[PDB]
Structure formats: structure tokens, C-alpha cells
């Protein structure tokens, strides 16, 4: 399997302008008839090369003439001797029931549905399966009426009929030209939640959410969130929906989260279905996020699409940015920002130091489904947010408007978007463009000096990006570096120089530079990299007192949280070293007192307090170190929790009781209170055992919502409380028939700190609620074990690695996309000690030798073993 390179992009030899599809649907054998109107742009002797995978070709016609000048090659149908313009007709057969990979047309329970992004449409018929080929689609679907009473595709229904033998048909038309990755088809029997939204200018849009029979009680929040997405896009970005109908279909078998197929989004049911007894606050907010995300793609992705897949971030980084702004505007901006930063520092930074490192706009790709990454998505969004930071909101929106004005109806590039932003704002983004082409995380080193004689404060800022596995050459970036200087009373010192205000976003563009501020009347405590203003590692020699001062005084909530993270980081590192020496946890009294102050400060937003009181995950902890000791990290996180639970016991219980709420509501103030309360409960669970057991079991049994029940159950597991087994069995007995709800329980099994967790996880492969056929089950058990139980996954005997090899041996053949997702923990081997590294290598070597190794795994394994 051969890499493709961005620099090899060339406009296509042929275009397709219109495609008429007919599906004669059956799960065992579907017959597809595709009639395309084509135009040659290249040389008269260049053949038409159509992509196709696992198709059974029945016939090829060119202007109704059966064609002889063609051949099939690996992954292609190559047609020679064509006129300049012509009708292509292909008939081919496919087999949805055999499609375990869930790419193309496949079966989800009794439904048939598609997933075409990135290169799935070629599993349906022979086509120019590349996103710079846009065409107007009409789609006729013919099927058994009892099995498939609903037959859906993109756009509007234009024709309908009934046939003999209990078959019927429906034809759809979508007036907007699209790349084929945005094609969708769904067939099945559903309950349908129907509603309407009227856009700002008066267009009435029929909203239809299709869910499995019996699930309509779990549909209203997703519908509500769609309507909120539509309104918000109008208010913030001035964008309205452009069709008559908006359909969403929730399917249980889906490799990823959700898909923005024009007018017919297809969602993993995990990001649709919610009721207060089945879904947590975090599920509600995830659903809101993802519904929004796919909606936002209607403009950033569909009305302007991608020229080639190396431009994926053009839509994904921008659309994540939009989903984050949506979430932030509707909810707590601080909490949104905190948690996006946790993901960047804790998961994205790890990718950017791994063998799979790539720039947000990749240069080389073997399997494009491997590049739906933290980097393309989350770091992509940080790059868009940097543009926002540099331009300001009004200029940013002018840029968005210029982008759409230039590129509406076409496929564009990352560079086109940056150019629009530059031209509309008159901000020079030439240097900035290097964020698109350079991989790895910049390290920004800051030193300071205060000169009491001149009242000048000098920051000396330096940057460098270390080399990564993919790029040996690195250069300085245009880093927007936001600061705020605090005096001894906690007030902001105005930033200025030579009598002029200075913008608080510093342009850090060189390897080294100095910034000098005047009229600095007191030695400042700085807030540096405010609101994580660039996706960089910050090296600054903070004192504990500067950090506790920020936790008390900083103006932005985010900076209060971030100061706490820097305070903890020091002691996390101390205590990992101590764990390796066999020593107890050491923590200064003044660090504990800082957290006591947060617990007792009645001015602090509970949402913020809750996040300060949520320790960094084991993934965020791992980013503090060059070589990761995952056992020491897990034990340190546990010991730090135990120490704070003891020290803060009375305060924790008082805050726990004070935030009790008898009504459950999905409302942001209520969520914040509950999050603080359950944060307190987490510490209490790790305190004196008897009290813990009582609090936790009572919360579980008395909870009137899944947030409170799960928080209690999760604490019982994490602290290994006496009540654990009984509560876990109760949840199983009550919820085993509900896969989404059981996913939570599988995650808690997989992430258990118990000594025999791997034995228990292996046994759960035979659980009544588990199946290797369902990506969500796989990810909640196997994936959570490998990815979120690094202490057990990285057990010294290598047992974790061998278990993952066994699972991947199956998944490599069954569902390579899910396999590739699950291999990630193994490809980080260079972060671990020599002995783990050798075992991880031997596991990778074994996988490399699989018969029929998928391209998905091959790409990652070869990078890892280099
Ligand atoms: C591969 C696709 C399911 C990903 C989708 N375009 C998203 O960003 O939500
Ligand atoms: Na020709
Ligand atoms: Na076209
Ligand atoms: Na799109
Ligand atoms: Na808000
Ligand atoms: Na996240
Ligand atoms: Na988020
Ligand atoms: Na593939
Ligand atoms: Na420029
Ligand atoms: Na200094
Ligand atoms: Na990490
Ligand atoms: Na089972
Ligand atoms: Zn997306």
C-alpha cells in the first residue's frame, strides 16, 4: 500500500456534473445503476479512471453503447477512448450484509445505511471518488415495503411508486452539487420525531429525527439541540439552513461519531439518544456539541467543501471551532475552554510527539481514515482560534463572509481560507500559514525582569519546536501570546510602552525576542498564555505563591484553573519520582490550603470550582514527562486524591451537602452545582472507608438521574469500596438490554484499578451486552482498557499488550477503522522504558506479520517500528 502526497494534487482529467442512481436494495445483494454525465477536461488520450472497491461489475455503457474499451485493475475501472462529453452508465452489485467494515452501504441492525466519508462511495459504485468532483445527485431507491418502509436520501422527494411483489420506491433530488463523500442512503423502519424550525428570513424547515422503534422518548433533546444549533448559526455567523427538510438518522452501528451528509445526517445513536435516567449531563452536552457540529458543516464543509483530503482541517478545524463557540456561548465558556485545553495538552500533544505526528494539513497519507485526528480536529480548531485571536471577532466574521462569497459552491483549500481571512482583515498571515505545514508542539520559554528604577517589565520569550518523526526541519511560528500583568492587590496593570497602549496579545514571531512594558508601577505577577492563546508548551519558572495568587485573583476563570494546573504539575512530578523510590506522597501544606480556599470561596462559580477540583487525568499527567511511568502516574493520582480527601474532609462534605439538588434539570447552573457536588464525592470516596461506602451507595440508590447514579458508581469502582460489586451487578441487571447505557459500565470495568482487571475484561468479552460486531461496545470495553487504563494496559508482564494483539488480530479483518483506532496505545512505545518498549515492539512485529494486514494498521505499525 502506497502513500499519497499532497504536492501531487492535480485537477482531474474528467468531471462529472450530474449522477442519477438507482438502488435495487436487498441486504444480500443490492444492484446499483449509476448514470453519470461526464466531461473531459484533460487530454483526448487520457482514460477515465474510476475508483471502485469490492464491486461486482455487470455492465458499462457510454451513450447507451455497450463499451469494449475498458479494463478493471486493482481498485479501479479504467475506460479509454471516450468522447469529450458523454453519459456513463455503470451497473454493479454489492453486498451490504457482508460489509463488516461499515464503510459504504452496510447494515445497522435491520436498517441499511451508508458511510461514504472519506472514500466509501467507491464501495457502492465506480466513481470519481474525490472531493473536487461535485455533481448533482438524484437517487431512486427500490425496496421491500415491509422491511424498509422509509427510504431516504439527500434532498427532497420528487417521485414515489409502488410495485408488484410488495416492493416500493422513492426518488430524491438534491439541488446542490456535492462530492460523493456527502451522499447518504438510509432504508428501514423507524419512529420519527417531527418538528419545524423557521429561519430568520422566513424559510420553514421540516425537521425529522429517525430512531429505532421504541426510542422516541430519547429523541427530544437532540431535536431541541438541532433547533438551538440553527438559531445560533444565524445569530453568531449569519448563516441559515438552505433546504426544505433536515433529516437525522440515529444508527447503533457506526465507526465514528456522526456525519454531515447534506440534508440527511447519519449519527451514532450515542450522540442522539438521551433521557434523564439513561444519559449524564456530559452526554447531554456531547449530544448538543455533535448535533451542532454536523449542522455547522452545512456551510463549513458542504456549501464550501475540500479540494482534496489533505485539506480536511479546512472543514474539520473550522467546524470544531464553531462547535466550541456554540457550546461556549450557550453554556459556560470557561468550562468549555478548560476541557478543550485538557484535550489538547493531554491527548493532542501526545499525538504530536508520536510516530503518527502530522501537520494539521498533512503531506503524506496512506489511509485517509487514519487522519481524522486530534491534530486535524482539535489542533485545527486552535489554529482557527489563533486567527480569531489575531483578527478580533468582527474581522474574523468579515473573513468568514469573504470565504463564503469566494468559494460557495466549490471545493477549496486551507490556503484559500487563510487568504480570505487575510484579505478581509488586512492582517498579514503569511508567516501564520506555517501552522498548517509544520508538525509538533512548540515550546515557549519565558523569562522576566522587573526594573524598579525605570518601572519597566521585560519579558524575554523564546520558541522552538523539536524535530518530529515526520519532519527534520522546524522554524519559528507566528505565536499569539496573550498576557495580563497583576499588581499586589490583584488589579490589572495597564500594558503600555512610550506612552501608548500595547495590545495584550504579543506577536511572538522569532526564535527569541524581548518585550518591554513601561509604567509598571509594581513587580507583576503575570498571567501567561492567557486562555491558552496558542497550542504550545509554556516553560516559565513559576513560584507556588505566584500560582496561588493567580488562583485567587486572576480575572479570567480559565487562568485560575490553569494556575492550579501548574501548581499541581510540580507536585505530580515530585510524587512520580517518589513512587519510583518507594516513598509516600509528599505535598506541602500551603498547596492543600490553596484547594481548601477554592472549596470555601463563595464568590467562585461552582463550574470553575468543580474543574479546579478535578485532578488532571492520567493522560494529562503523562504529558508532564519525557518517559512515561504509567503505574506511578496512576498511583500518584490516587494518592493525591486520598491525601486531599483526608486533609479537606470536613470542607468536602460540607460542599457536597450544600450543593444537593432535589429537582434534576439540564440547565447550566444546575449542571455546575452537580459537577461540584460530584467532584466532592469523588474525594470523599477516597477518604474514610465507612463514610465513603455510605455516601456512595446512598447516592447511587437515591439518584433520580444517571449523572448522580454514575458518579456514585464510578467512585465505588475507583476507590474499590465494599458496595462496588453489588452496585455494578444492580446496574447490569437493570440496564443490560440497553447498549448505550452499558457502554458506561464497560468503561468502568475497563478502567477499574483492581489487580485482576484484565481477567475481568477478558471475561466480559462473553458478556450478554457485549459484541465484537458493534464499534461502540468494542470501544467502551477494549478501547477504554488500552487507552484509559494505562496502568493495566502497561502491566510489566506484557499481558495488556498481548490482549490487544489478540483483539486486533480479529478487528484487522472485521473492521480496520476500529482496529486502527485501538492500536494507538501501542504506537506510543517510544515514550516508555526499554523493557516495555521491547514488549510493545514485539507486539507490533506480530501484527505486522498478519495475513491480509489492512492499510489502516500498516500505516501506523510501519511508522511505529521505524
Ligand atoms: C469520518 C466522518 C464520520 C467524520 C465527520 N465528517 C465529522 O467530522 O463529524
Ligand atoms: Na479519446
Ligand atoms: Na463536477
Ligand atoms: Na462536509
Ligand atoms: Na456562555
Ligand atoms: Na474534548
Ligand atoms: Na469540546
Ligand atoms: Na480503506
Ligand atoms: Na500576507
Ligand atoms: Na524573573
Ligand atoms: Na499524554
Ligand atoms: Na455477547
Ligand atoms: Zn466534522
The molecules bound to the chains, other than polymers, are: leucine, sodium ion, zinc ion
Task: Return the CATH class of the largest domain.
Answer: Mainly Alpha
Question: What form results from the Cα inertia axes?
Answer: globular
SS summary, helix count = 27
Number of discrete domains:
5
In CATH, the architecture of the largest domain is Alpha Horseshoe
Spatial sequence of strands, sheet with the most strands? 6-5-9-3-2-12-15-14
Give the fraction of residues assigned to helices. Answer: 40-55%
- The count of β-strands is 34
Task: Output the radius of gyration.
Answer: 28 Å
CATH topology of the largest domain: Zincin-like fold
Beta-strand content: 15-25%
Distance between the terminal alpha carbons, to the nearest Å?
17 Å
What structural category do the secondary elements indicate? alpha+beta
EC number: 3.4.11.2
Protein name: Aminopeptidase N
Family: Belongs to the peptidase M1 family.
Pfam family, one: DUF3458_C
Describe what you observe in this structure.
With 866 residues, this protein is α+β, with helices and mostly antiparallel strands. It folds into 5 domains: 11-190, Immunoglobulin-like, CATH 2.60.40.1730; 191-275, Zincin-like; 276-439, Neutral Protease, domain 2; 440-541, Sandwich (Immunoglobulin-like); 542-866, Peptidase M1, alanyl aminopeptidase, C-terminal domain (Zincin-like fold). The protein has 27 helices and 34 strands. Helix content is 41%, strand content 22%. A hairpin with a 5-residue loop joins β27 (479-486) and β28 (492-493). α6 crosses α7 (414-425). The strands form 9 sheets. The protein has an 8-stranded mixed β-sheet, with no helix packed on it. The structure holds leucine, sodium ion (11 copies) and zinc ion (ZN). Residues 767-768, 770-771 line the site of one sodium ion. The site of zinc ion (ZN) has 4 residues, from α3.
Amino acid at each position: 500500500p502506497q502513500a499519497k502526497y499532497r504536492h501531487d494534487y492535480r485537477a482531474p482529467d474528467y468531471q462529472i456534473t450530474d449522477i442519477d442512481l438507482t438502488f435495487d436494495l436487498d441486504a444480500q445483494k443490492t444492484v446499483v445503476t449509476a448514470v453519470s454525465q461526464a466531461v473531459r477536461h484533460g487530454a483526448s488520450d487520457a482514460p477515465l479512471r474510476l475508483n471502485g472497491e469490492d464491486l461486482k461489475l455487470v455492465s458499462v455503457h457510454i451513450n447507451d453503447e455497450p463499451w469494449t474499451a475498458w479494463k478493471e485493475e486493482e481498485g479501479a475501472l479504467v475506460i479509454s477512448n471516450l468522447p469529450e462529453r458523454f453519459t456513463l452508465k455503470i451497473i454493479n452489485e454489492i453486498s451490504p450484509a457482508a460489509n463488516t467494515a461499515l464503510e459504504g452501504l452496510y447494515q445497522s441492525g435491520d436498517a441499511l445505511c451508508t458511510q461514504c466519508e472519506a472514500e466509501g462511495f467507491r464501495h457502492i459504485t465506480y466513481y470519481l471518488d474525490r472531493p473536487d468532483v461535485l455533481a448533482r445527485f438524484t437517487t431512486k431507491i427500490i425496496a421491500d415495503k415491509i422491511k424498509y418502509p422509509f427510504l431516504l436520501s439527500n434532498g427532497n422527494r420528487v417521485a414515489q411508486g409502488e410495485l408488484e411483489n410488495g416492493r416500493h420506491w422513492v426518488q430524491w433530488q438534491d439541488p446542490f452539487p456535492k462530492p460523493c463523500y456527502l451522499f447518504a442512503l438510509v432504508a428501514g423502519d423507524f419512529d420519527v420525531l417531527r418538528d419545524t424550525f423557521t429561519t430568520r428570513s422566513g424559510r420553514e424547515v421540516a425537521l425529522e429525527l429517525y430512531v429505532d422503534r421504541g426510542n422516541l422518548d430519547r429523541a427530544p433533546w437532540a431535536m431541541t439541540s438541532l433547533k438551538n444549533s440553527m438559531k445560533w448559526d444565524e445569530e453568531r455567523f449569519g448563516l441559515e439552513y438552505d433546504l426544505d427538510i433536515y433529516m437525522i438518522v440515529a444508527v447503533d452501528f457506526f465507526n465514528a461519531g456522526a456525519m454531515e451528509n447534506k440534508g440527511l445526517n447519519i449519527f451514532n445513536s450515542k450522540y442522539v439518544l438521551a433521557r434523564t435516567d439513561t444519559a449524564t449531563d456530559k452526554d447531554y452536552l456531547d449530544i448538543e456539541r455533535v448535533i451542532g457540529h454536523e449542522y455547522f458543516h452545512n456551510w463549513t464543509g458542504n456549501r464550501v467543501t475540500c479540494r482534496d483530503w489533505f485539506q480536511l482541517s479546512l472543514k474539520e478545524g473550522l467546524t470544531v471551532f464553531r462547535d466550541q463557540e456554540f457550546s461556549s456561548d450557550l453554556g459556560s465558556r470557561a468550562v468549555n475552554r478548560i476541557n478543550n485545553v485538557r484535550t489538547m495538552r493531554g491527548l493532542q500533544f501526545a499525538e504530536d510527539a508520536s510516530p503518527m505526528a502530522h501537520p494539521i494539513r498533512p503531506d503524506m497519507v496512506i489511509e485517509m481514515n487514519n487522519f481524522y485526528t486530534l491534530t486535524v480536529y482539535e489542533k485545527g480548531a486552535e489554529v482557527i482560534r489563533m486567527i480569531h485571536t489575531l483578527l478580533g471577532e468582527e474581522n474574523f466574521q468579515k473573513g468568514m463572509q469573504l470565504y463564503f462569497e469566494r468559494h460557495d459552491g466549490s471545493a477549496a483549500t486551507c490556503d484559500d481560507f487563510v487568504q480570505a481571512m487575510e484579505d478581509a482583515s488586512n492582517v498579514d498571515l503569511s508567516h501564520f500559514r506555517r501552522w498548517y505545514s509544520q508538525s509538533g508542539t512548540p515550546i515557549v520559554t519565558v523569562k522576566d525582569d522587573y526594573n524598579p528604577e525605570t518601572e519597566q517589565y521585560t519579558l524575554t520569550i523564546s520558541q522552538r519546536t523539536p524535530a518530529t518523526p515526520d519532519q527534520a526541519e522546524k522554524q519559528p511560528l507566528h505565536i499569539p501570546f496573550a498576557i495580563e500583568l497583576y499588581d499586589n492587590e490583584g488589579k490589572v496593570i495597564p500594558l503600555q510602552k512610550g506612552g501608548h497602549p500595547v495590545n495584550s496579545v504579543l506577536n511572538v514571531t522569532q526564535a527569541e525576542q524581548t518585550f518591554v512594558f513601561d509604567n509598571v508601577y509594581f513587580q507583576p505577577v503575570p498571567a501567561l498564555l492567557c486562555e491558552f492563546s496558542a497550542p504550545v508548551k509554556l516553560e516559565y519558572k513559576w513560584s507556588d505563591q505566584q500560582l496561588t495568587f493567580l488562583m485567587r485573583h486572576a480575572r479570567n476563570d480559565f487562568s485560575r484553573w490553569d494556575a492550579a494546573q501548574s501548581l499541581l504539575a510540580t507536585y505530580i512530578k515530585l510524587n512520580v519520582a517518589r513512587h519510583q523510590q518507594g516513598q509516600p506522597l509528599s505535598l506541602p501544606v500551603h498547596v492543600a490550603d490553596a484547594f481548601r480556599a477554592v472549596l470555601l470561596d463563595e464568590k467562585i462559580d461552582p463550574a470553575l470550582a468543580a474543574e479546579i477540583l478535578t485532578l488532571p487525568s492520567v493522560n494529562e499527567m503523562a504529558e508532564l514527562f519525557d518517559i512515561i511511568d504509567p503505574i506511578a502516574i496512576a498511583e500518584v493520582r490516587e494518592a493525591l486524591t486520598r491525601t486531599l480527601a483526608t486533609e479537606l474532609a470536613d470542607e468536602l462534605l460540607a460542599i457536597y451537602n450544600a450543593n444537593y439538588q432535589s429537582e434534576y434539570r439540564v440547565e447550566h447552573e444546575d449542571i455546575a452545582k452537580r459537577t461540584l457536588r460530584n467532584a466532592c464525592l469523588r474525594f470523599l470516596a477516597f477518604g474514610e472507608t465507612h463514610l465513603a461506602d455510605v455516601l456512595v451507595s446512598k447516592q447511587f440508590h437515591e439518584a433520580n438521574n444517571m449523572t448522580d447514579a454514575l458518579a456514585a458508581l464510578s467512585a465505588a469502582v475507583a476507590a474499590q469500596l465494599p458496595c462496588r460489586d453489588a452496585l455494578m451487578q444492580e446496574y447490569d441487571d437493570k440496564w443490560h438490554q440497553n447498549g448505550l447505557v452499558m457502554d458506561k459500565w464497560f468503561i468502568l470495568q475497563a478502567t477499574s484499578p483492581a489487580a485482576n482487571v484484565l481477567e475481568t475484561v477478558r471475561g466480559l468479552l462473553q458478556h450478554r451486552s457485549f459484541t465484537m460486531s458493534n464499534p461502540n461496545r468494542i470501544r467502551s470495553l477494549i478501547g477504554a482498557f488500552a487507552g484509559s487504563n494505562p496502568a493495566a494496559f502497561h502491566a510489566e508482564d506484557g499481558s495488556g499488550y498481548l490482549f490487544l494483539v489478540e483483539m486486533l488480530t480479529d478487528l484487522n479483518s472485521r473492521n480496520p477503522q476500529v482496529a486502527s483506532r485501538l492500536i494507538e496505545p501501542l504506537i506510543r512505545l517510544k515514550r516508555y522504558d526499554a523493557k516495555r518498549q521491547e514488549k510493545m515492539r514485539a507486539a507490533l512485529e506480530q501484527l505486522k506479520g498478519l495475513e491480509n494486514l489492512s492499510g489502516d494498521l500498516y500505516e501506523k505499525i510501519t511508522k511505529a517500528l521505524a
